[PDB]
């Protein structure tokens, strides 16, 4: 089935700053991926993105009975939904799970790659740092960044390229909004 | 501290695929199941805390379909440009023997929103326990999607995420095994 396909997208966006305080609403319309016209809350009336949207902006601005709804969206749509859902989105807090283990690999020669896996946490804001017998290991540690599991939890692996010498202890420390105090996992 | 809620919707022809959903900071809150015409919250919890009348979504989709008729004609019948997806396979959490886990197949940066994903375990396909999401919007207006698979980690099992999409001239495969 190789018949042409034609895609239509619409995105009703609500941008929040300092909470439900300073808000901005966007009414965006797309043909494939090119947005062609949109209502910018900060602008007041639909503006044409590309020339393919010239007719749509002129047509909608005419109806001031319409322009009144979109101009009230920040309060009627955005701020309203933010309140309904902040209980379980904005305030959502999920404990991270920290596991430290030796890489089931070792691409680096005779150096042992130590992995610190932080799993199932929310929100996305988190901070993972490695420690050796006291002191931080800034160099020789790269991560996967933030990974989304798609089910409202994240994971991130912060690997550490270590040079093995028995008599040392390794500590992975995590600080997250859901934590009362840093989580720490040691590896001997 | 800064957040974003997006009500994204799309319509596809000649497939007549329609989608309506809410996205808060990159995660899905719910989408409306077009065939049954009932709302589906990503997490059961969301359900008893907030509600959405499906019927209001079919309304908008019906319009997106109407506007599509218009735009197609306007763009002088310009079809979309297939964009193949980059497939990455990974696990929900650190993997440990006989300890229930989840294999995730993340399909990214693609469009149009029509893909066919399959899970293979040592050759033959597996379909028990699997689950998936609808297409998630990306800021660049392409799409994402997740497919899950529960399993008991073994030493001899090699799992395969198989993805098909018009942008790929041939089906893709993404291997994953313990080691």
């Amino acid at each position: 089935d190789t018949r042409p396909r034609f895609l239509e997208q619409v995105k009703h966006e609500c941008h929040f700053f300092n909470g439900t305080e300073r808000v901005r609403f966007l009414d965006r319309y797309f043909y494939h991926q090119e947005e062609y016209v949109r209502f910018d809350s900060d602008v007041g009336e639909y503006r044409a993105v590309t020339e393919l949207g010239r007719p749509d902006a002129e047509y909608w601005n005419s109806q001031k009975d319409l322009l009144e709804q979109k101009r009230a969206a920040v309060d009627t749509y955005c701020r309203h939904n933010y309140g309904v859902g902040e209980s379980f989105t904005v305030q959502r807090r999920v404990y991270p799970e920290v596991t430290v283990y030796p890489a089931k690999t070792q691409p680096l020669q005779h150096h042992n790659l130590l992995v610190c896996s932080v799993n199932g946490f929310y929100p996305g804001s988190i901070e993972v740092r490695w420690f050796r017998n006291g002191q931080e290991e800034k160099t020789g540690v790269v991560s996967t960044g933030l990974i989304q599991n798609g089910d409202w939890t994240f994971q991130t692996l912060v690997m550490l390229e270590t040079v093995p010498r028995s008599g040392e202890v390794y500590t992975c420390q995590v600080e997250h909004p859901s934590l009362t105090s840093p989580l720490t996992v040691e590896w001997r | 501290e800064e957040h974003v809620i997006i009500q994204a919707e799309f319509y596809l022809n000649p497939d007549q695929s329609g989608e309506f959903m809410f996205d808060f900071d990159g995660d899905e809150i719910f989408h409306v199941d077009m065939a049954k015409k009932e709302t589906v919250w990503r997490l059961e919890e969301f359900g008893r805390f907030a509600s959405f009348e499906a019927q209001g979504a079919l309304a908008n989709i019906a319009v997106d379909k109407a506007n599509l008729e218009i735009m197609t004609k306007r763009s002088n019948y310009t079809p979309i440009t297939n964009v193949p997806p980059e497939v990455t396979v990974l696990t929900n959490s650190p993997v440990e023997l006989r300890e229930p886990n989840v294999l995730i197949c993340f399909i990214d940066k693609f469009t149009p929103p029509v893909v066919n994903v399959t899970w293979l375990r040592n050759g033959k396909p597996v379909t028990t326990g699997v689950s998936e999401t609808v297409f998630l919007p990306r800021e660049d207006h392409l799409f994402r999607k997740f497919h899950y698979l529960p399993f008991l980690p073994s030493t001899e099992d090699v799992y395969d995420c198989r993805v098909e999409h018009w942008g790929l001239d041939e089906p893709l495969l993404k291997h994953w095994e313990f080691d």
């Binding site: 939904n81 309904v84 | 919707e9 218009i70």
Partner: peptide
């Protein structure tokens, strides 16, 4: 409470 969908305006042909 419940989430309110924002309407998708129809274009003219």
């Amino acid at each position: 409470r419940q989430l309110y969908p924002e309407w998708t305006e129809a274009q003219r042909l």
